[PDB]
Amino acid sequence: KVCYFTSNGITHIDYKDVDLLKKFVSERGKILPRRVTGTNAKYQRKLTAAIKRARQMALLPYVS
Amino acid sequence: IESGIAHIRSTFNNTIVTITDTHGNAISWSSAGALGFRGSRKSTPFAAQMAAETAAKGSIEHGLKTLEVTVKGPGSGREAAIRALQAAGLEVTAIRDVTPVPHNGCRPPKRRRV
Amino acid sequence: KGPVAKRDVLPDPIYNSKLVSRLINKMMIDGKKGKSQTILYKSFDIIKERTGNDAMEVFEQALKNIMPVLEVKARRVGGANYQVPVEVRPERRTTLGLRWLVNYARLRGEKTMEERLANEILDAANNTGAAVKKREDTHKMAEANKAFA
RNA sequence: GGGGAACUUGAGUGCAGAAGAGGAGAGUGGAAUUCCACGUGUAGCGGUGAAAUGCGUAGAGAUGUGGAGGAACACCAGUGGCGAAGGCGACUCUCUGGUCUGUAACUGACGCUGAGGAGCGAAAGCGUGGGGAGCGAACAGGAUUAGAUACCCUGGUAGUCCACGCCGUAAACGAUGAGUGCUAAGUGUUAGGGGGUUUCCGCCCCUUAGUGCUGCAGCUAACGCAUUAAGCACUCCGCCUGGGGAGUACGGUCGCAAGACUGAAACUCAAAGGAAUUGACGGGGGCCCGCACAAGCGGUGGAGCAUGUGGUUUAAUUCGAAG
């Protein structure tokens, strides 16, 4: 029920920083949806785009 | 020859069990088709029990003892071969739930009623 | 609907050894009283002569050797008519064992009924009866189809 | 109505912002499937209600490496978002469209609709050159069956995919044409804005534009609709006049073709329909009972005989009875 990004008012993702994406990806490799994250709607799409570019860049794994 | 993987295919039609070297060299394998369960009797957990325990008993002639097992695909053999391998006396470290789910893959066959 | 069970023809309550129990009552599934009990007593005796030991002892040893533990029932699921085995309740066990005892007692075909039942008592005390045969038959076929449940 | 002078709300231009699977082109990544080479590996794999056809001792399936290739982008994902509609989900870049909020810095009615006309327009199909992994009409075999050109199994061609043209149709649906204004409320949700709190974390109250669900008034034959009207009104377009015959015939107009658009009549019927009610039925669902089935026992039909009935025959085999 708490949105992390509005909680500290952080702006756009800056995809190079990764450790938050680490705890936004499941341990088997999929994205945690809003049912468990509870983020705001307009940030979830830039989140999933960010972890997608991370996956293409091979810092975050497709499967684990 | 002390460890390796157990590969078990559970299907709606048949249950397969295979032991192999850690780098993939197979020693022994079994299935309900091997033990004579023919038709759709190959899908019962009891035949999964029997095939798994007889493959574990065929593992002894090269003498592996500790094991990790990969369960493959859905069906009643998902847990039956697991309990059979654990009750067979051979040490199992953990089970792995890997499924060959793609992202999309090719389209499946036609919807099997019409 | 509703499971019911009931006592029938039990003997006197106190000091009921099974020999006096089936001496005064019990088994008697041949028809009516008279030419059902007399004959049973004669069969019971012609085996004391044969083996000089306790008739009721060898009788329940015969019953024990007849006792099954598995019985199969059929099912309509699937177009192949699978059959499923279940554990037999003890009352069903004793009545069914006694049923096969009496039916191949009358089926086994000797010159008269008392020696027929006498030879059946011997051939069920030892494991060479037709009832012992069918006992192992259903036992092994239940073990064959035991995979279903 | 015509002419002349106004004005800024309608419609617009600027300025500041926001969101989007909007579109065209190019490049890139991963999971699987298939196929091939090799290592290990025995005897089955696979398949269904049973099964069988197939594939396997010429080493299959299983299993791990290493390639080849084409396909669609898991999770994200939401009665979410975008687009006029068909439709658009992996990522990156180029180009390009559109929508909404504030703002009144400028024009001053430039607006609406739209016959003809023009352009887009799912899938299947057609033309030329590619490509062809899986899938898979046709077709082959094996099943099922009284029969099975099908449902089922194993294969499998065209196509599905790309480039460029053509066809121009669908249940192309919200079965609701477009624009404008008015009319109780409640509750989500998208993208914005403003005020009090602090200009934080997030609280409240407004606020436009959508987007869902409820629900007044009103309306409807009823179902129901209801600020995203099927209410109240106005403008403009398209369309209907009983069911068949029939979107057929003729004749034009396109199309390479399949066909598409335009579209009668003769004859014939007295109905066809929509919504709802009560029943019945369901190889629909939820509960329950009955020697209904199960668990057993004894029987019938196998034999003779008695009796009733049918059929046949007789002069008549007296009539009535029929799951």
Side-chain angles (χ1 to χ4, degrees):
Chain A
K1 310 296 290 222
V2 155
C3 179
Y4 184 167
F5 282 54
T6 88
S7 74
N8 33 50
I10 174 64
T11 206
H12 92 74
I13 300 328
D14 273 313
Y15 82 88
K16 286 63 42 179
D17 159 4
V18 165
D19 52 16
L20 57 167
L21 330 180
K22 264 324 194 212
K23 38 155 199 54
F24 291 18
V25 48
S26 88
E27 81 305 349
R28 296 318 265 181
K30 29 189 77 45
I31 308 85
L32 327 163
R34 316 171 50 65
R35 305 277 74 73
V36 284
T37 82
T39 84
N40 155 289
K42 86 162 302 304
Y43 293 61
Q44 209 262 7
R45 44 195 181 256
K46 55 167 47 69
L47 255 294
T48 172
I51 166 177
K52 275 166 207 277
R53 74 200 70 260
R55 226 175 295 203
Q56 172 149 330
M57 261 313 316
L59 293 77
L60 217 30
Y62 283 82
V63 277
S64 49
Chain B
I1 320 106
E2 90 75 31
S3 176
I5 321 90
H7 289 108
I8 47 174
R9 203 90 61 101
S10 175
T11 87
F12 263 70
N13 312 2
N14 194 358
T15 295
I16 322 292
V17 49
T18 306
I19 206 65
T20 186
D21 163 78
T22 316
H23 294 171
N25 283 231
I27 321 93
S28 94
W29 59 269
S30 156
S31 73
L35 290 63
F37 300 93
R38 295 204 300 185
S40 301
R41 336 295 90 72
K42 328 184 288 281
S43 208
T44 174
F46 191 84
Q49 284 313 122
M50 282 265 298
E53 72 165 285
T54 196
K57 225 63 53 200
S59 68
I60 324 310
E61 37 252 45
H62 262 297
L64 85 85
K65 201 254 278 195
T66 184
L67 184 31
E68 71 304 344
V69 50
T70 36
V71 71
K72 195 34 52 183
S76 64
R78 204 96 175 271
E79 52 285 33
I82 284 323
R83 274 162 291 91
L85 256 286
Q86 193 198 137
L90 303 307
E91 166 70 281
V92 76
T93 56
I95 89 168
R96 190 173 294 280
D97 55 346
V98 46
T99 60
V101 46
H103 301 321
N104 317 146
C106 312
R107 64 171 300 91
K110 72 103 200 165
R111 186 41 302 161
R112 210 208 67 71
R113 184 41 41 171
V114 169
Chain C
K1 299 192 188 173
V4 285
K6 67 66 173 171
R7 158 235 61 81
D8 42 342
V9 308
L10 264 305
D12 49 332
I14 65 167
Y15 286 102
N16 199 45
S17 171
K18 205 71 59 177
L19 63 103
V20 71
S21 93
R22 211 157 267 110
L23 169 62
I24 309 301
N25 289 75
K26 220 162 188 68
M27 189 320 291
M28 26 60 57
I29 171 177
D30 318 308
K32 296 86 170 179
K33 308 296 192 283
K35 293 179 179 179
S36 183
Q37 79 304 7
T38 132
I39 213 143
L40 229 72
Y41 296 166
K42 275 178 253 157
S43 202
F44 254 113
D45 315 345
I46 311 146
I47 67 73
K48 291 260 204 186
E49 162 265 298
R50 212 60 58 106
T51 88
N53 62 328
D54 182 24
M56 187 315 305
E57 177 67 38
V58 289
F59 169 61
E60 43 83 15
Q61 186 260 290
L63 176 70
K64 172 185 53 59
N65 284 51
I66 288 295
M67 282 335 297
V69 301
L70 287 182
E71 163 50 15
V72 65
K73 69 176 290 184
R75 198 65 195 274
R76 181 55 16 202
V77 177
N81 295 358
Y82 328 134
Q83 330 186 9
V84 54
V86 294
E87 152 270 307
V88 198
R89 274 163 55 210
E91 326 93 295
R92 190 84 189 289
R93 276 203 285 243
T94 166
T95 192
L96 201 62
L98 183 54
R99 162 197 311 281
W100 311 290
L101 172 45
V102 62
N103 93 312
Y104 332 108
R106 65 175 58 111
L107 189 137
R108 74 164 294 146
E110 268 89 346
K111 206 63 66 78
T112 180
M113 201 46 158
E114 60 271 56
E115 73 200 11
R116 275 199 296 274
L117 269 82
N119 300 341
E120 273 312 288
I121 290 310
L122 313 179
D123 298 354
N126 160 305
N127 301 315
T128 312
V132 193
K133 180 90 138 64
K134 188 205 63 44
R135 191 208 90 95
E136 68 63 40
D137 262 357
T138 88
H139 256 271
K140 80 169 192 261
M141 81 86 78
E143 212 82 52
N145 87 284
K146 76 189 297 181
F148 284 104

